[PDB]
Structures are given as structure tokens and as C-alpha cells.
């Protein structure tokens, strides 16, 4: 039902200055915090209205954590390079994805933490939140350090407590935008592409959250082979958009039907034009 | 609030 997730990106740039650290936080599909170390005096910035109501004790704390992580990830990028016996001239990336998931019950459903190196799975926290799954030999050197540091213990405690606790607070403060699901604005457009060939486009617009299911049915059956599905795209105003298209024979357009599925809708919708 | 433990890899 609800989730709080943090996405980290550490990037080495030999000769182009000190490694760049980007931290970004989300409550479901709504971003609320940002941090870029590339700024003059780097600070945590709000990206949602319901987070601006937080006091400076919160803001100087986020800045402290992310400033510390910037230093930690400079050392981590340097160390992983040594593990993989890589050139000091190459540009490498460490990415972290951690967070907690909540069911409709409001209780912790699942805690997670995953780390990557150059777009490849590196070190992940197991479902028990006690052990590590190291992808290779180098990732086992990181694991042994993280075992002695008691990362899994203090991370499990955070994901079960503080993560869930703060997510609930963010969900209450933003109950009007976060807990209210915007349904999509639908319509189907006709675009002739030949003498007897035409394209039907089913539009799903201004919907929140991002999860949607758009399908074209020719008199009751699905057309996965014909259905040109477009990737869900952000409208740029905290809403999302997607479209489904089918090339049909002229006259037979009416036998084609679009089915849209979203949580903002009480029951699935059917369109045809 | 983010995780408050920064550990070197």
C-alpha cells in the first residue's frame, strides 16, 4: 500500500574533481528530499510541500548524514576499484536503494537494502535482515567489514522502527496528496496510417500513483503482439501518463476496446472511439 | 529520515 525509499548515487570523476554524491528520497512515487554534493554549500532541499513543515533540526540532520555519506562513498569508490584491480582513470558508480514497505494494515510488510557497482548487483540485505548476499569475491570483502561494523543489526532496527515511523508521519502530513489516488483522464484517438489501416490510441493522463494497466481488446481478446505500449512517463507536475496503440483495419475500429486499470478508479474502465 | 550509519565498503 505505502513505501518510503532512498536512492543514492556515488560517482568517481578522475581529474574532474572530488567524487559526486547524489541522495534522493521518495514516499511512494512522490519525491520529497534531494541532496547534491556538487553545490557551493551542499544542503538537503525539500521537493514536496508537506515536508517544508519540518523544523531546522530535521534539515541540519539530513545534511549531516548526506555530507558524511559523501565522504564514505569517496572511500568506497576508491576501495572497490582496488578490489576489481581497475584503473584509477576510469569513472565508476556505486548505487544504493533501501527502504521499508507497509501493507494496508499500516504494519511493516518488507524491509530492503540493495547496493550496486557499475549497474551490477553487488551487496544485498537478505529477507531476514540479518545476513548479506555478496554477488562476487570482492563483495565478500565489503560483507566482512559490514559484519564487524554491525550494519545488518542497526539497519534492521532502522527499517523496522525509524523508517516505518517517519513514513507514517510523512503519510499523515501529506494525507491530501499522498493517500488520495488521482484517477486517469481517458480518451481514444483515431489516426489513419493507410487506405484501410488506422492507429487507435488509448490515453491515460494525470494519474497518481504511477502503476497502471492499459490493454487493447479485439472483441474480447488481448493483442500483446499488436499493442504498441508506451513506457509510463512523468507529466512533470507529480502526475503520470501512458498510452496504448493498435493498427486496425478501417471500419472494424468499433470492435476494438481499451481497458484501463488504476486504484483511483472504483471499477475497471472501458473506452472505444 | 534516512539511515544514520555510514559504513565504508
Amino acid at each position, epitope marked *: 500500500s505505502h513505501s518510503m525509499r532512498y536512492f543514492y548515487t556515488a560517482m568517481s570523476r578522475p581529474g574532474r574533481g572530488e567524487p559526486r554524491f547524489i541522495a534522493v528520497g521518495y514516499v511512494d512515487d512522490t519525491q520529497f528530499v534531494r541532496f547534491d554534493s556538487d553545490a557551493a554549500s551542499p544542503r538537503t532541499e525539500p521537493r514536496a510541500p508537506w515536508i517544508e513543515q519540518e523544523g531546522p533540526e530535521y534539515w541540519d540532520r539530513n545534511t549531516q548524514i548526506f555530507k558524511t555519506n559523501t565522504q564514505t562513498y569517496r572511500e568506497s569508490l576508491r576501495n572497490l576499484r582496488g578490489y576489481y584491480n581497475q584503473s584509477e582513470a576510469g569513472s565508476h558508480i556505486i548505487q544504493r536503494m533501501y527502504g521499508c514497505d507497509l501493507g494496508p494494515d499500516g504494519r511493516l510488510l518488507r524491509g530492503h537494502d540493495q547496493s550496486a557497482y557499475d549497474g551490477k548487483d553487488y551487496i544485498a540485505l537478505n529477507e531476514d535482515l540479518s545476513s548479506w548476499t555478496a554477488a562476487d569475491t570482492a563483495a565478500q570483502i565489503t560483507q566482512r567489514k559490514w559484519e564487524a*561494523a554491525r550494519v545488518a543489526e542497526q539497519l534492521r*532496527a532502522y527499517l523496522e522502527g525509524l523508517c516505518v515511523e517517519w513514513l507514517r508521519r510523512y503519510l499523515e502530513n501529506g494525507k491530501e496528496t499522498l493517500q488520495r489516488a488521482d484517477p486517469p483522464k481517458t480518451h481514444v484517438t483515431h489516426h489513419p496510417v493507410s487506405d484501410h489501416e488506422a492507429t487507435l490510441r488509448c490515453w491515460a493522463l494525470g494519474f497518481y500513483p504511477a502503476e497502471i494497466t492499459l490493454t487493447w481488446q479485439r472483441d474480447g481478446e488481448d493483442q500483446t503482439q499488436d499493442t504498441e505500449l508506451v513506457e509510463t512517463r512523468p507529466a512533470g507536475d507529480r502526475t503520470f501518463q501512458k498510452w496504448a496503440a493498435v493498427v486496425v483495419p478501417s471500419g472494424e475500429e468499433q470492435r476494438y476496446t481499451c481497458h484501463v486499470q488504476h486504484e483511483g478508479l472504483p471499477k475497471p474502465l472501458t473506452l472505444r472511439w | 529520515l534516512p539511515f544514520d550509519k555510514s*559504513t565504508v565498503m
Partner: T-cell receptor
Framework: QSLEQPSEVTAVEGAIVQINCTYQ??????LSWYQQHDGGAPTFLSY????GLEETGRFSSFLSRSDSYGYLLLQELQMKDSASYFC??????????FGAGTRLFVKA | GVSQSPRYKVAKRGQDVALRCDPI?????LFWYQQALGQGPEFLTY????????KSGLPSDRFFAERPEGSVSTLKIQRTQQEDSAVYLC????????????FGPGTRLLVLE
């Protein structure tokens, strides 16, 4: 952001002793214990992140996060155990808050 | 282990003092602490390699901590006062914060008139 522990505790050689520590913070990350002899370096004993018991030979430390309570238990008391024992609370980050310490007197 | 020099130091008021700390090799994290009689160590400054991430615990701007190379750390106390008298302990952690700390024997500083 503080913690409490008794000033002094006394026990006989071969006996067991308990040093209680209550912490009062808003974001607990860990409860650790340190041994310090007069004019010496504080040495690590045990750390508690999650609830339960941590055993390291004659030293064991308990933790309860719901009660914000933790204690250190020392077995088979020797004369070298006469020192100051400190409980430390980690609240995320790096700033560690130490207690005033408990001076243990081992009676021969 | 962690070494610290000098073991003891007596100084006159207004004089500058320098305290050296040699932590364990490979320890990314470094801490400086002040210890008063009948009390525990109180945080002064934090280091992650050469970067001084915090110094909120330092009493005055007379206090200056450095670690140019992320190994040896020095603490210079410009114009000493009687209130500066305490044991200055230095500690280190291998890979970051919220971990097991490894302490030095500390410098017992006594400032006099």
C-alpha cells in the same frame, strides 16, 4: 539526550556483579560498554544494537529498547576487574554520549 | 593499538599546546574526546579520513584539530586556560560511525597560572 548509571558498585573476588544503565534519547542506534583503569585507555567490552544478550567470556550485556534499559554483568570477579565501567549510547551518526561511569571495587 | 603523546603535560596560562594521536592503520574514523574527573569522555571533533565532518563539541576556536593525511591527528590548543585542564582521549573506528571504538591512553593536560 542523556544516560544514567550508579556511581559505585562493590563485589567480592569470584562473585558476579551487575551495572545498570538507562538511556533517554529519541533515536537509539546502539548501547556499548567500556572498561577504564585509572589513567588508562577505555577498552571495548560489548555492543548491543538489537534486544538480547551479548556474551564475550566473563562479560555479558543485556538490552531492552522498549524499556530504554541495558546492563553489564561480569562473572568470576578478579582484582584486575577494579576499574570504571561506562555505558555509551549511539543515536545515529558519530556523536557518542558516555555516562558518568560506575567505579567497581573488587574485595579480595 | 592507538598511541597518544605526551602521556602527561603541564603548561602555563596563555601558552600554546600540541597533542598528537596515532590511530590504528586503516581506521577511516577518528574521534577526539575531553574527559573531566568523575565523568566520561565528551565528544569534541569527528574525522572521516582527512575530512573533519564535525567539531560542535569543541569549547572554543582556540582549539584546532587536523588530520592532513588520514592517519596521524593533532589537536592544538592556542592560549591555554585552567578550564582546558582534562584528559584528552583520541579514539578510532575501522570503517565509520556507530562502531567499536579503539582508544589511546590519552594526554593528561594541566594548565596553571
Amino acid at each position: 539526550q542523556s544516560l544514567e548509571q550508579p556511581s559505585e558498585v562493590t563485589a567480592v573476588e569470584g562473585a558476579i556483579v551487575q551495572i545498570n544503565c538507562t538511556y533517554q534519547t529519541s533515536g537509539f542506534y546502539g548501547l556499548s560498554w567500556y572498561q577504564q583503569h585509572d589513567g588508562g585507555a577505555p577498552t571495548f567490552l560489548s555492543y548491543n544494537a538489537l534486544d538480547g544478550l551479548e556474551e564475550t567470556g566473563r562479560f555479558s550485556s543485556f538490552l531492552s529498547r522498549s524499556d530504554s534499559y541495558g546492563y553489564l554483568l561480569l562473572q568470576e570477579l578478579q582484582m584486575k576487574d577494579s576499574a570504571s565501567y561506562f555505558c555509551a549510547v549511539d543515536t545515529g551518526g558519530f556523536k557518542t554520549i558516555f555516562g558518568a561511569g560506575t567505579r567497581l571495587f573488587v574485595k579480595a | 593499538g592507538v598511541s597518544q603523546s605526551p602521556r602527561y603535560k603541564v603548561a602555563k596560562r596563555g601558552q600554546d599546546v600540541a597533542l598528537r594521536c596515532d590511530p590504528i592503520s586503516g581506521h577511516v574514523s577518528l574521534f577526539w574526546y575531553q574527559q573531566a574527573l568523575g565523568q566520561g569522555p565528551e565528544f569534541l571533533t569527528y574525522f572521516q579520513n582527512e575530512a573533519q565532518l564535525d567539531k560542535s563539541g569543541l569549547p572554543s576556536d582556540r582549539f584546532f584539530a587536523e588530520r592532513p593525511e588520514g592517519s596521524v591527528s593533532t589537536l592544538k590548543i592556542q592560549r591555554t586556560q585552567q578550564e582546558d585542564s582534562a584528559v584528552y582521549l583520541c579514539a578510532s573506528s575501522p570503517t565509520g560511525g556507530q562502531e567499536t571504538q579503539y582508544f589511546g591512553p590519552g594526554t593528561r593536560l594541566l594548565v596553571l597560572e
